[PDB]
């Protein structure tokens, strides 16, 4: 009976932990995809600044 309790508990534990690790990895990945996208868009705004500066000469 102790063995059966232990293995049920260990199953819960491992399922809990695996899920926590996937939801964190997923979150960091999604965030990074978004941050990269926004950084490209910001490079473009900086480039448009330079164009308008280049025009002023």
């Amino acid at each position: 009976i102790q063995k059966a309790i232990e293995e049920n508990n260990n199953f819960i534990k491992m399922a809990k932990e695996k899920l926590a690790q996937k939801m964190e990895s997923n979150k960091e990945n999604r965030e990074a995809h978004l941050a990269a996208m926004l950084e490209r868009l910001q490079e473009k705004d900086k480039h448009a600044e330079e164009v308008r500066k280049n025009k002023e000469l």
Partner: protein
């Protein structure tokens, strides 16, 4: 004097209910526990099975789900049982020996022992216990053998007797029956003094081939069983000389402690006509009237008890019983002299002027263990269906050990068959 009766699980409660209906009728006890019979023979040994102007079965009803015990309570003699003697859980055992023996059964077993103790404690001189169960399910098999072990610990000098229904593929509920039966047989070998082996395949074939019932129900099978249980307990329950208590029966029937598995039989079994003592005797010894699906001509009798019931010539009984032994002497081991004993009770079963019941300790019972062993191995070699057991905490090694122990039993029977 007193025997305490325990019935566990679906099969165990269903046959146990029928046993109590049948013996209550024989002892003149009505469904309200009142005595309305007309022979003092009925009451002389009533306290063996009944506490006392009412008579109440010394019976404990156990299960891990409520349904069969609800039917018992509603059934014919359902109000005769003491209400405190119904002990049941809710979760069930799922046809799983591990659930009965180790997990669910473990939660309920102490409450069963409380009731066992209360019944034992008002006994003037408890002789021991009789348990009805199947070996193929979860509760009767796993929890029933757990109970037997716990009773032995608390009453180690009392006799333990079982009526144990052995599974068959031909009359089967689940594929895991051979696992549950192998695990149980290992317990019975160590912890019972006497086990009546009742094969569901034998019951079916008797119903189908001999009784001409086209489609047998469990009800049909249990009718057979309850008739046989009545026959085999006759000498416990009525005045007499021979096998009159559980311990005397064991001393006469069990020459080696492990070889305590008996093949019972009943006669008559036919599809109004008078039966003769010759006919009873011949039918009682015929393989087709025996309830373990083993051919006694494939082995030898170590010991036999025969019980005749009804008005009949004691002289002709002794005569025919000597004819069978003298005519078939090779099937009786010669190194146990006078190994067949005969009792006679005047009271017949209901509906019959005359009957006979056979209890054989035959080396042919090896065939029943071998069959279960082969069905166990076919699955266990592929570890099939084991997850149901391992999920309750059991290890494979316990299955290996049960299989070995049952194969050992088979070898032990073979040795004495050859001796």
């Amino acid at each position: 004097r007193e025997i305490v009766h325990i019935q566990a699980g679906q099969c165990g409660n269903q046959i146990g209910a029928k046993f109590w209906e049948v013996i209550s009728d024989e002892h003149g006890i009505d469904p309200t526990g009142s005595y309305h019979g007309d022979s003092d023979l009925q009451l002389e040994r009533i306290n063996v099975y009944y506490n006392e102007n009412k008579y109440v079965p010394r019976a404990i009803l156990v299960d891990l789900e409520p349904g069969t015990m609800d039917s018992v309570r509603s059934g014919p003699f359902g109000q005769i049982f003491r209400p405190d003697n119904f002990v049941f859980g809710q979760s069930g055992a799922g046809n799983n020996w591990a659930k009965g023996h180790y997990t669910e059964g473990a939660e309920l077993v102490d409450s069963v022992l409380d009731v066992v103790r209360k019944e034992s404690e008002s006994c003037d001189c408890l002789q021991g216990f009789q348990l009805t169960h199947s070996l193929g399910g979860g509760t009767g098999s796993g929890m029933g053998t757990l109970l037997i072990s716990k009773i032995r610990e608390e009453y180690p000098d009392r006799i333990m007797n079982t009526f144990s229904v052995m599974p068959s593929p031909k009359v089967s509920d689940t594929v895991v029956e051979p696992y549950n039966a192998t695990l149980s047989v290992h317990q019975l070998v160590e912890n019972t003094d006497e086990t009546y082996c009742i094969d569901n395949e034998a019951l079916y074939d008797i119903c189908f081939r001999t009784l001409k019932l086209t489609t047998p129900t469990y009800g049909d099978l249990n009718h057979l069983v309850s008739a046989t249980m009545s026959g085999v307990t006759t000498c416990l329950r009525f005045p007499g000389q021979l096998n009159a208590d559980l311990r005397k029966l064991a001393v006469n029937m069990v020459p080696f402690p492990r070889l305590h598995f008996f093949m019972p039989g009943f006669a008559p079994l036919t599809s109004y006509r008078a039966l003769t003592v010759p006919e009873l005797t011949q039918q009682m010894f015929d393989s087709k009237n025996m309830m373990a699906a083993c051919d006694p001509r494939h082995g030898r009798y170590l010991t036999v008890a025969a019980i005749f019931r009804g008005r009949m010539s004691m002289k002709e009984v002794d005569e025919q019983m000597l004819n069978v032994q003298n005519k078939n002497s090779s099937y009786f081991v010669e190194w146990i002299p006078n190994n067949v004993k005969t009792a006679v009770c005047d009271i017949p079963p209901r509906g019959l002027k005359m009957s006979a019941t056979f209890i054989g300790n035959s080396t042919a019972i090896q065939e029943l263990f071998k069959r279960i062993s082969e069905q166990f191995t076919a699955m266990f070699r592929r570890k099939a269906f084991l997850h149901w057991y391992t999920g309750e905490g059991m290890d494979e090694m316990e299955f290996t050990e049960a299989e070995s122990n049952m194969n050992d039993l088979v070898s032990e029977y073979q040795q004495y068959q050859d001796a």
